[PDB]
């Protein structure tokens, strides 16, 4: 099954993602194919998939930016029916906004079926143009048609996945304890993590004994990423990944505070020094506490 | 002995505190007697006392606001010698800025002796006026003269004292772990703690599932108090007290994040809800983690 999470949904035939046009929250905003840049935040092209209780493999798809839902216009089963952004809720019974998402016949891409109409999300004519129509269309679960096949590029981790990434790190102290705060996290490209740091005012901040030392920098950076999350996105039900760690050196006679993020493949953590914006695989401390 | 810490230094005879005039960092700024308001931050009247290694009962006294040191002008032993703010360092060998501070004959107030001159800090003529001269003056350790007696009203806690206050609270979970970040903390009046919250932008913030929920409010409030500390004070070697806690309810089926501060008498913690600015003795959770 598709897991709860945030996805960048990419056509199997051409490099077009599912895009809410101009990120608009207006009801009836067209959802279109659009080109994308890997290893960025594609602002209008992220979708939170919420599983529906007691309906197998069926989800709402909420645009992270607008907070509006993928909606099959009037639930029509006619081929060519508009797919738009529309106001809704995460656990709606409105079948216009319910989508059954299961693996295609290639076992890697998915098909997206409207629960009401039983028609499929279709990049019409496989058009690679920016702004190409996406429609509900006749189809089957088993056919090869790439117009109706979609790669669900997972952009989020669960708290379980974040925990596993920390646990396989070689710089964790014997006494380590972690404290999980949220359930599902958007993983930032380092380019975006760096931009939030650059815009926080921390690059200008001076180290001062106790009054603005390592713990102040690390907590400020976590607060800055929290503020950015709320200010940037209108959807709810996820957080932005940014951890704080406390660490102790090999000799056991110095301790530090710093941040951490996750690799592109979501498998490993990377340390971030908020005093200088550096990313490190070894920050010279073993972590004895984290909260994230 | 006087402990390392931040003090409001109050004359034993009249309600005048030791005040760095206008908080000025200029060398030779007069240090004067001035009236004060209890249960506020008296901005020009806080002094960080740093003990000198291997010199018994002897300290530098750094004005928290200016970052400049109490200085006996040219170290003169003449009665009436100016006491001023002057640039220095926490562990100076400059005897103009070194002060032996021991209990007076009443066993509650102190006398303040310049280490070089062996004269005493004196509120001249016991003048209660705002801006009254404070001078180095002839005296003895044992005499009753209230012009030369000073109550050292302790405004800070050690991390050991903060730990003891948490430990005697009745709302601590069996599994509690605390993580100490700094050594010596200025304890805020609730009026100041509230002002920092009011000026943080948190009063306007809306609760949102995961993306700005309890953990975001509590970490934002700690970051806001950290920023206020660095921006407000020029001295180094202390922090502002503001804790984050994670808690779990009696039933063990809900958890929350919130802040905490300390009572006036420094003996107990008080919980702070950053979602509504309320202070509580019981916030309906038992703390299983804190960092402060």
């Amino acid at each position: 099954s598709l897991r709860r999470g945030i996805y960048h949904i990419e056509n199997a035939g051409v490099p077009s993602a599912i895009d809410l046009k101009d990120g608009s929250s207006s009801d009836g905003t067209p959802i279109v194919g659009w080109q994308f840049t890997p290893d960025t935040i594609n602002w209008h092209q992220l979708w939170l998939a919420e599983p529906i209780p007691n309906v197998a493999d069926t989800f709402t798809l909420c645009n992270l930016f607008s907070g509006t839902y993928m909606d099959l216009y009037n639930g029509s089963s006619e081929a060519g029916t508009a797919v738009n952004g529309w106001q809704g809720t995460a656990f709606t019974t409105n079948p216009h906004q319910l989508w059954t998402i299961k693996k295609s016949s290639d076992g890697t891409s998915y098909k997206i079926q409207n629960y009401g109409s039983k028609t499929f999300v279709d990049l019409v004519n496989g058009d690679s143009s920016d702004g190409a129509k996406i429609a509900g269309w006749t189809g089957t679960w088993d056919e090869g048609n790439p117009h109706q096949k979609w790669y669900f590029n997972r952009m989020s981790v669960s708290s379980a996945e974040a925990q596993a990434a920390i646990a396989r790190n070689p710089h964790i102290h014997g006494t380590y304890r972690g404290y999980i705060l949220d359930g599902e996290y958007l993983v930032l490209p380092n380019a975006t993590f760096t931009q939030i740091w650059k815009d926080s005012g921390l690059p200008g901040s001076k180290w001062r004994e106790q009054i603005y030392d390592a713990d102040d920098f690390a907590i400020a950076m976590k607060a800055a990423v929290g503020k950015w999350g709320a200010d940037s996105w209108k959807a709810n039900g996820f957080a932005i990944f940014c951890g704080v760690m406390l660490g102790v050196n090999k000799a056991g006679d110095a301790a530090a505070a710093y941040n951490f993020t996750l690799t592109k493949d979501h498998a490993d953590i990377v340390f971030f020094e908020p005093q200088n914006g550096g990313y490190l695989n070894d920050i010279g401390y073993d972590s004895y506490m984290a909260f994230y | 002995s006087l402990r390392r810490g931040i003090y409001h230094i109050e004359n034993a005879g009249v309600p005048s505190a030791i005040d760095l005039k206008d908080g000025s960092s200029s060398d030779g700024t007069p240090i004067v007697g001035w009236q004060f308001t209890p249960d506020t931050i008296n901005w020009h009247q806080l002094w960080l006392a740093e003990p000198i290694p291997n010199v018994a009962d002897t300290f530098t006294l750094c004005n928290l606001f200016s970052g400049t040191y109490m200085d006996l002008y040219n170290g003169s032993s003449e009665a009436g010698t100016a006491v001023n703010g002057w640039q220095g360092t926490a562990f100076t060998t400059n005897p103009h800025q070194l002060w032996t501070i021991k209990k007076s004959s009443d066993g509650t107030s102190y006398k303040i002796q310049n280490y070089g001159s062996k004269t005493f800090v004196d509120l001249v003529n016991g003048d209660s006026s705002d801006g009254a001269k404070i001078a180095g003056w002839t005296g003895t350790w044992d005499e009753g003269n209230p012009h030369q007696k000073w109550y050292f009203n302790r405004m800070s806690v050690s991390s050991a004292e903060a730990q003891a206050a948490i430990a005697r609270n009745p709302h601590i979970h069996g599994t509690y772990r605390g993580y100490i970040l700094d050594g010596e903390y200025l304890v805020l009046p609730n009026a100041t703690f509230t002002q920092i919250w009011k000026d943080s932008g948190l009063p306007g913030s809306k609760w949102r599932e995961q993306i700005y929920d309890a953990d975001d409010f509590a970490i934002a409030m700690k970051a806001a108090v950290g920023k206020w500390g660095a921006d407000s004070w020029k001295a180094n070697g202390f922090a502002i007290f503001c804790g984050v806690m994670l808690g779990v309810n009696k039933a063990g089926d809900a958890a929350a994040a919130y802040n905490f501060t300390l009572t006036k008498d420094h003996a107990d913690i008080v919980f702070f809800e950053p979602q509504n600015g309320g202070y509580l003795n019981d916030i309906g959770y038992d703390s299983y983690m804190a960092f402060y």
Binding site: E209, D213, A214, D215, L246, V248, N249, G252, D253, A254, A255, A256, A257 | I180, L181, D182, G183
Partner: peptide, 4 residues
């Protein structure tokens, strides 16, 4: 050690 203290977090510094």
């Amino acid at each position: 050690p203290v977090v510094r």
